[PDB]
Structure formats: C-alpha cells, structure tokens
Amino acid sequence: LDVLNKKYSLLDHMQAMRRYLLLGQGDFIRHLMDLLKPELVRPATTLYQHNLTGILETAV
Amino acid sequence: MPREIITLQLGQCGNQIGFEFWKQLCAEHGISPEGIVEEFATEGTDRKDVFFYQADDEHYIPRAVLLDLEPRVIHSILNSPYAKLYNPENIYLSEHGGGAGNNWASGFSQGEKIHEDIFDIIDREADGSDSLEGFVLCHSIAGGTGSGLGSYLLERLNDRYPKKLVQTYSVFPNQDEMSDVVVQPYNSLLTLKRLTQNADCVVVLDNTALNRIATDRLHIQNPSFSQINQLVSTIMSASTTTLRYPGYMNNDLIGLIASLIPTPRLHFLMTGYTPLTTDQSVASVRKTTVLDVMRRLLQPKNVMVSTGRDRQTNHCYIAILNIIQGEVDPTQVHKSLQRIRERKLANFIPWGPASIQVALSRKSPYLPSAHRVSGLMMANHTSISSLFERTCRQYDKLRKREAFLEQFRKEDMFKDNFDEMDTSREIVQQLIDEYHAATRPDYISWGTQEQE
Amino acid sequence: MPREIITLQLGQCGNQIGFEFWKQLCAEHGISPEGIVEEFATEGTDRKDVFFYQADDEHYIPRAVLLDLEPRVIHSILNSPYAKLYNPENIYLSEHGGGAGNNWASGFSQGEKIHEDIFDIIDREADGSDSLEGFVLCHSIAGGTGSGLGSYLLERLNDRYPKKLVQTYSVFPNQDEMSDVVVQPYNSLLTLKRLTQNADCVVVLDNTALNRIATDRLHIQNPSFSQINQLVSTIMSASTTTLRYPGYMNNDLIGLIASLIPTPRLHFLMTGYTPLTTDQSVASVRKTTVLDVMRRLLQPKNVMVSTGRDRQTNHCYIAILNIIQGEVDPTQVHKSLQRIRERKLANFIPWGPASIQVALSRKSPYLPSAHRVSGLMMANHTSISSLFERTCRQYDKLRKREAFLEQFRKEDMFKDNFDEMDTSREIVQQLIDEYHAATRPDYISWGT
Amino acid sequence: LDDTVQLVSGFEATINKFDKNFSAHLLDLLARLSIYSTSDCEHGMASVISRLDFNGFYTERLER
C-alpha cells in the first residue's frame, strides 16, 4: 500500500478519476464542453486529432 | 474560465450592500482589505474570476462597480478598509454628487446624463473580467440613486449589452412602515417599470422584512442600513459559495436558474436561507438532517423574501431549488425528497412535472464555517406577485393623492406624466395573473397574449 | 570580426541619450569611465567590439561619437566621467558652437559647415572598426542640432556609405504636449523627410510618451530631461544586452532587425520594455512568468509609446519581436506563445504571416540585475501611426498657420519655400495610412 | 547593374513564382508535419504551426 501510494498514487489516481473521468471538475468540464461545442458541433470527419488534443490541453 | 459577474451597488442602501458583499467575497476568498490573497488562503480551488479580478500575481480585486448619483456612498465605500481591494477603474462616482433626491425619474435622468461615463466605468471593470457573464445590481427601489440611477444604468447596459443577462438585487421600500418619502412609492414604481422593461431579474429586498428580521431575530429595534448591508453581504457570500467551492454541478448561475425561470415575466425571485440562527449560536455545529433542513426551510420565518398575503390568487410553489452547504449525504437528500413528497411538503406546478431540487455545496476552505450545514432556498412561488401587487397599491396610494409627485415631475422621466407608475401597476397585475395561472393546469397557456 | 557600431549623439537630447547610454553600457560591462575594463569585469562574454573599441588588450573604449552644433552639450558630455570612453578622433564638433537654435534648417546648414570635420571623424572611427556595419545616430527630432545636423549626417552617410546599414535613435517631439518649440514641426518634418529618403531605420522616441510613462508608470509627476535620458539609457542597455550577453541567436544587428522590417518602407520601429516597474516597486522581485512577463509588457501602462486612442482605425501589430533577458524556462515560453495565440493578445497583419519573435537572453554579468527575468518588445504596430498621425497633425497645424515659418525662411534650407515640410507631412500621412493598411489584408496592395 | 525595366519585371515575376512554389512546398511540408505530429503526439510541431500562422496566412493553405 505504501508503494502503491508513493509510486502509483492509487488513492490519488482514484481521486483523479473522480475529478476528471467522473466530471468532478465541473467548471473544467463546462469550459471544455464550451470550447468543444464549435468543434463538437462539426462533422466528426472534420475533426483533427492534433487539433482536438491541443484544444483539450488548452481547456485544461 | 469562470463567468465573471460585475456587482453594481446603487444609492446609499445598494452601495452599502455592494461594499459589504465585496468585503464578504474577499473574506470568503481570503483576500486582504487591500485585495491581496492571504497566506492562509492556499486552497486555489475557488473561482475568484467569477466575482474577483486579479490586480497582480498576488492581489485579487473584486469585479465590483459601486455606482451612485450621490458621491457620499461611493466615498464611504472608498473610505472602508477594503478601498484598496477593488480596482479603482471599476469605481464610478457621480461627479455632481447630488443624488436623485429620492426620485426614480431624477436618477434615470442622471444616469442618462452620465451614460457615457457610466458605460466607460462599466467597460473598465469589464476589462478586468476574463469572461464577464453580466451585471448584478444592488440598489434600493425607494431612494433616488439606487432606484433611478439603477434604472438608467440598467437601460444603458441593455442598450450596450443586449445579449447579456441583467440581474438586480433591488431593495424595496418597507411596506409596513409609512414612508416619510411620499414619492417613495412613485420612485419604486418607476424603478420597477424599468426593471420590467430593461432588467431580466429583480431580487426584491423589502426593508420592512429586513427590519422585522433584525427586530425579531437580531433584537435590533431600528435596523440600520449597515445591518441590512451586512445581511446582504452574508447572502451574497452564500450565493457565491458555489463559485468559491467548485463542484460537479451548478458551477454557473445560468445552469442553476434555467430550471427556475420558465418565462421572462416570471422573473420575480424569492429567496430562502437555512438554518436561521442568531449570531450567538454559531458555536454549535448542529448535525442538521436533510429532513430537518427541509422542515426548517418551510418556515416563513426562514424565507428571505417578504411576499404579501394574496387573498385573491391561490398562490403555490411552481418549483423549489435548495442549495445546501456543508456535509450532505446524497442518500439523506433522496430520503428527504421522498419524505417531502409523501408528506406533500412541497407543492409543484400543476401544468408540468416539478419537484424540489436539492443542491449540496462545499464550504469555503479559507473561511472557517461555524455551522456544519448551511442552506439556500430558491423557490418559485406565486405569492411573490402579491409583493408586486402591494408595491403597485402603494404607488397608486401615492399617485391617487399625487403626494410628492411634483419632485418626480421635476425630472424628465416623470416630468410630463406618471406613466411609469401605471406601467408598474399593470406589470404587477400581469405578474399576479400569471402567478395565479402558474398554480393552475392552464399555465400551459399562461403568458400567451390570448390568456393575458 | 564583430560588426562595430558607431554611436552618434546629436543635439541636447541626443547627446544626453548617448552619454547616458554609454554610462549604462559601461556599468553593465564593467568598463571604467576611462575606457579600462574594471577588475570586477571578468566576464569576457560581452561583445564590446560591436559598441566599444579596444584601446589596448585590456581597455575597452565605447565606439560613441558625441556630436553637437552647440559646444555647450559636447563640453558637458566631455565633463562627465565617460569623456575618455569615446575616441576623440571620432568626435566632430561644429566650430561655431552656436547650435541650430532649434531649427532643422539651421542644423542642416551647420552639418554642411562641419561636413569636412564630420566625414574626417567618420573615417577615423571607421578605420577603428574591424567590420563596421554602419552608424547609429542619437538625436532629437524637435531641436535644431539633433534634427537638422542629424539629418545632414544621415544624408551624407547614405550618399558616402550606401552599402552600410543606417540605424537611428531619433528622439521625436512630444506629440501629446503642445510643443513650445514653434519650429518643432519644421524640425520633425525635416527628420521625417530624411528618414523616408536617407535613413534605413528610425527608432521613434516620443518625449510625450516619455512624460506619460514617467507619470503613469514611473510615478514621475514632471519627467526631467535627465530622467528621460536615464529611461533612454535603460532602453539602450536592453537593446545592447545581446552585445553585452553574447548568445546563440540575434548576435548581429541584421539578425535582430530582419524580423521587424519586412519591406524597406516598413522601417519605423517601436520599442517596448518589461518588466515595467515604478522606482518605488524595485523592492519585490516578482517571479514573473513568460506569460506574466508578456502580459505586463502587453499592458499599455508598460509600453514606452503614448499612442492616442484612435477610435476610427482598428490598429494592429504588423510585427513583434520580444527580446527576453534573464532566467527563462523554455516550457514557460512555450505556454506563453500558446496563450498569446489563443488569447489573441496581439493582432497581426492580415496580408501575410506575422508573429512575436521571442529571444531569451542572459543579463550583463557586471551589473547586478534586481530582476530574474527582463524583456524587450520590438513591435511594428499600427497604433504607432497614431503617434505618427498626431505628429503629422501638429505639422499640418503649424504649416496651415505658417507658425514660426519666418524663422525657417531665415535659413537657406527653408529660405525659399517649406515644400520639404509639406512633402514630409504628406509622406508621414501616407506612412500612418500604410501602418493602418498593414493591419488589413489589402496591405499586399497598399501603396501601389 | 540596371528592356531593363522589362528585365526587372520578369525577374520579379520569376521571384514571385519561386516564392509561390516555396509556399506550396511549405504547406505540403506542414501537412506532412501534421501527420507526423499526430502519429508521434509531438506538441512541439503544433506550437511551431500555431506560431507560423498567427495571422492565419498559412492557415488557409493548411486547410487547402
């Protein structure tokens, strides 16, 4: 358990899952969705993976 | 990015409320009276950009604009320890300092005269806002500056910012006390007219209710404007906690209020606070349960809105949103909602599905909370129309006697007629009719011109 | 070999700027007032040969020329501790010592009178330069000597040294203040004429902007000429840091200026400095980030140019070069560039690609820096036209009023007409419009 | 050294044509760089691209 906490942050990883994958960072999730809206309204064929990753990093 | 909110404090009462609100926000965010974040405020999890701007890498400045047609209130804000907290470019003081003379029409004319300067000040404060959502007006409806200048400022903001929401916290005159300002009902009527035409939301603050609460709960025989302003600052802090304690839901005002305001006319909001405690009882953090919270909230003594007893309209709750702060168990919230439904503790709209929404919120980590659980109630109740009907009746009582109407007739907005008072009475009548319809299944057609 | 630069300080303002620049450079490089390297100046990492010449194997002497048409200013410079910094053989002084009387035409006539002496000084300094790039003139555009004699010197350098670069440090008259120098518009017109025809680069130093910055940013209620000269010396120090702190990039003037001047006409440069702090605020070394540094530099309160608020023209940056000096993290720079593009903190030309170049530089080791990170902005911004448009408006206001034109008609350059002033005003108007045009996609055809 | 005006205009036209070809090759290079950046997740090339088209001059060519 000490190794898991110090090296893999298992409890911290679970808290991160809650904050991000469970949309716990609601202000962050709101801003991400707002930024994606002009992209996410577009046809998925028009999405650029590099552009989507950059948008994700920018919103973060 | 946070949706920044500009706070407009208008007239003596409004400006005191705005100043105390900015003080409360600074205290909740750990901002010093100079605007610097305190060293103990290490929890960077709060959204200051909603209500504050950063003055430097260390100094947070409230996104607050103090606007008066009389310089005394702006100077009094600037004479507080928090004078250095706010960005000075966001401070607008009327050069003439004369106020509106408790005349809404005079305040409107002064705002029109200071329209360019006021909008320049508003833009200066806006530039400190990264993603300004809109303006919140703190004012009195009975005076001249907070009522009239507030109405003028609202009009000019609507013209310049027609796509932004405008909410107001409008302090209404005491309806149980005979106002010595015979035109106070006229000023209030003109301000309510402008709020009806140019504001999207008016938070009614009845000075009668503030005085009553101070007398019965604070044991204040004569509630001062300062005590009302401190209560308003507590209310503003509670309203901004969800910005200051970020979570999964209700991170923006529009997301919270969308479910509560179905039509533009039903824009009269009632407020509630829980638990209500006297200042001395802060010591014991009571483990209040969700059922106990809901039970205390249903007491009229705990509602922050003085709705008149309408005898003609079968007033009902359309919807309720409870913002609860502190340790809240979701299963306890669910059981409380179940018990409320079984006990019919909440009446819902008859024209559609409606329930009591419950929001759980964290407390500010930088501000020690003396209470384990705190709560805000948001409710749509048709009896709020009775407050507007009472204001209309007071206007008519002054207008029918033409009492002090000459002072409004001195100002161009009321110089030729008192049409703003008649429009206020008509708007309050339409509000009453819609509120009664909203208790009925025929609310589906409420607000339709055929139903009006 | 380094491209040596001769610094010419012209007239009262130009000579003050040059003297303070040489003082600041000496302090940053650890050069004694006599031109000898101080024992503490052990960091041989500076390129003195760009701005200084070596008198011996140990003593670096500034390649600075103090030029005045009035002997008072040259003597006052020679009364400073830095009198030995400049090569006396590179110093040409007008024999008449009378100055130009704040008349550009008089300054030009004095330059013509001292032409032989000036060109002898120029040749003497040129032989001392291993790889002379060109001459740098420090002068005022509002006076007579720095404006008129400076214009004459620029013309003669362009004619004689057509293959050499011509950079100028030109102090422009205050455009927001009503100049007491009724002939200031004539001096400014002659300087703008020469910049259009015979100068290759004009660095505009607006005394109005200096006063505005001193008041709002330096909290100086009445900026003195000495305080303006000290601000100019700080700017010159920042501009010479790349000579004083040698590095991987921007080691030459042409490399520095290439990013700012896309076409030969767009040779009007604006300057910026960061961090801007009031004299009282030296105490707190703020850990400013590259994003924070750029944000403070992007604040008009920190911009060393007081451009009027033009409401009609959507002024924009044509080009930006950010020279950042001090401790800089590459990841912070990358985040800063990303945020700048994302936040559109600078508007660029619509007719071509344009960006903010960022250089990270070391500080001078001999001068202790109170700031971990400092930064210079070089920018071509259409709002600089508003300063130029304001100068043009003042010129037109004087010409339409014929104000002080009788004094110019006394001088041979303006004796018969003021047509050079009118052509200068028209050129400055076209320049302002082109700077405004350079914000638009049709700038590709601007001036055609 | 300088029909001479005609020679100068022809030289300018040839220089402009070389510039056009260079710009086209640069846009093709940017597209290949984008492909490589998407394969290798190289944020550096994305920052370079965002620098290159701050005014959007290259943006239209990248879209094309």
Swiss-Prot record, chain A:
- Which compartments does it reside in? Cytoplasm, Cytoskeleton, Microtubule organizing center, Centrosome
Tell me the tissue specificity: Ubiquitously expressed.
Homology family: Belongs to the TUBGCP family.
- Summary of the function given for this chain in its UniProt record: Component of the gamma-tubulin ring complex (gTuRC) which mediates microtubule nucleation. The gTuRC regulates the minus-end nucleation of alpha-beta tubulin heterodimers that grow into microtubule protafilaments, a critical step in centrosome duplication and spindle formation.
Per UniProt, subunit arrangement is: Component of the gamma-tubulin ring complex (gTuRC) consisting of TUBGCP2, TUBGCP3, TUBGCP4, TUBGCP5 and TUBGCP6 and gamma-tubulin TUBG1 or TUBG2. TUBGCP2, TUBGCP3, TUBGCP4, TUBGCP5 and TUBGCP6 assemble in a 5:5:2:1:1 stoichiometry; each is associated with a gamma-tubulin, thereby arranging 14 gamma-tubulins in a helical manner. Gamma-tubulin at the first position is blocked by TUBGCP3 at the last position, allowing 13 protafilaments to grow into a microtubule.
Q: What is the name attached to this protein's record?
A: Gamma-tubulin complex component 3
State the species of origin. Answer: Homo sapiens (Human)
Its lineage opens with:
Eukaryota, Metazoa, Chordata, Craniata, Vertebrata
UniProtKB/Swiss-Prot annotation, chain C:
Q: Cross-referenced Pfam families, in alphabetical order?
A: Tubulin (PF00091), Tubulin_C (PF03953)
* Classification via InterPro entries: Gamma_tubulin (IPR002454), Tub_FtsZ_C (IPR008280), Tubulin (IPR000217), Tubulin/FtsZ-like_C (IPR037103), Tubulin/FtsZ_2-layer-sand-dom (IPR018316), Tubulin/FtsZ_GTPase_sf (IPR036525), Tubulin_C (IPR023123), Tubulin_CS (IPR017975)
Mod. after translation? Phosphorylation at Ser-131 by BRSK1 regulates centrosome duplication, possibly by mediating relocation of gamma-tubulin and its associated proteins from the cytoplasm to the centrosome.
Q: Which residues form a coiled coil?
A: none
Domain of life here? Eukaryota
Q: Which UniProt keywords apply?
A: Cytoplasm, Cytoskeleton, Disease variant, GTP-binding, Lissencephaly, Microtubule, Nucleotide-binding, Phosphoprotein
Q: Signal sequence: where? A: none
Q: Which residues carry this modification: Phosphoserine?
A: 131
* GO function terms (MF aspect): GTP binding; identical protein binding; microtubule nucleator activity; structural constituent of cytoskeleton
Residues holding GTP: 142-148
Where can this protein be found?
Answer: Cytoplasm, Cytoskeleton, Microtubule organizing center, Centrosome; Cytoplasm, Cytoskeleton, Spindle
Disease linked to the protein: Cortical dysplasia, complex, with other brain malformations 4: A disorder of aberrant neuronal migration and disturbed axonal guidance. Clinical features include early-onset seizures, microcephaly, spastic tetraplegia, and various malformations of cortical development, such as agyria, posterior or frontal pachygyria, thick cortex, and subcortical band heterotopia and thin corpus callosum in some patients.
Protein name per UniProt: Tubulin gamma-1 chain
- Species of provenance: Homo sapiens (Human)
Q: What gene name is given for the protein in this entry?
A: TUBG1
Swiss-Prot record, chain D:
**Coiled-coil residue spans:** none
Membrane-crossing residue ranges in chain numbering: none
**Domain of life the protein comes from:** Eukaryota
Write the signal peptide boundaries. none
Tissue pattern of expression reads: Ubiquitously expressed.
Localization per record: Cytoplasm, Cytoskeleton, Microtubule organizing center, Centrosome
Report the family membership. Belongs to the TUBGCP family.
Subunit record text: Component of the gamma-tubulin ring complex (gTuRC) consisting of TUBGCP2, TUBGCP3, TUBGCP4, TUBGCP5 and TUBGCP6 and gamma-tubulin TUBG1 or TUBG2. TUBGCP2, TUBGCP3, TUBGCP4, TUBGCP5 and TUBGCP6 assemble in a 5:5:2:1:1 stoichiometry; each is associated with a gamma-tubulin, thereby arranging 14 gamma-tubulins in a helical manner. Gamma-tubulin at the first position is blocked by TUBGCP3 at the last position, allowing 13 protafilaments to grow into a microtubule.
- Function text: Component of the gamma-tubulin ring complex (gTuRC) which mediates microtubule nucleation. The gTuRC regulates the minus-end nucleation of alpha-beta tubulin heterodimers that grow into microtubule protafilaments, a critical step in centrosome duplication and spindle formation. Plays a role in neuronal migration.
Connected disease: Cortical dysplasia, complex, with other brain malformations 15: An autosomal recessive disorder characterized by global developmental delay, variably impaired intellectual development, speech delay, facial dysmorphism, microcephaly, and varying degrees of cortical malformations including pachygyria, thin corpus callosum and subcortical band heterotopia. Most patients have generalized seizures.
Query: What protein is this chain from?
Result: Gamma-tubulin complex component 2
Q: Specify the species.
A: Homo sapiens (Human)
Which gene does this sequence derive from? Answer: TUBGCP2
Which residues of the full-length protein are shown here? Answer: 771 to 871 of 902
